């Protein structure tokens, strides 16, 4: 399916690790989704060649690590990434 809002992702932008995310509600670019960032709780627009199911790919990208914010972000993608941070 396509993405929809509430839709759990690793988000990977530039400079940045893969990080826990989701797809908010809103108008973004074209084929881009506004995503929320975990954490952090910074928003931006990405396409889904940057989005990378959380379910599929926790095993890999779900590994704790120094950049700021990051290890909040996993905790709330696994125990609560639907509250209104």
Known sequence: ??????????????????????????????????????????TAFLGPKDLFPYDKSKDKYGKPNKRKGFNEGLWEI??????SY
């Open 1 to 42: 399916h396509a993405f929809k809002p509430g839709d759990l992702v690793f988000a990977k932008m530039k400079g940045y690790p893969h990080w826990p995310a989701r797809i908010d509600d809103i108008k973004p670019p074209p084929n881009k989704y506004p995503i929320f960032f975990f954490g952090t709780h910074e």
């Open 78 to 83: 696994q125990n609560n990434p639907h509250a």
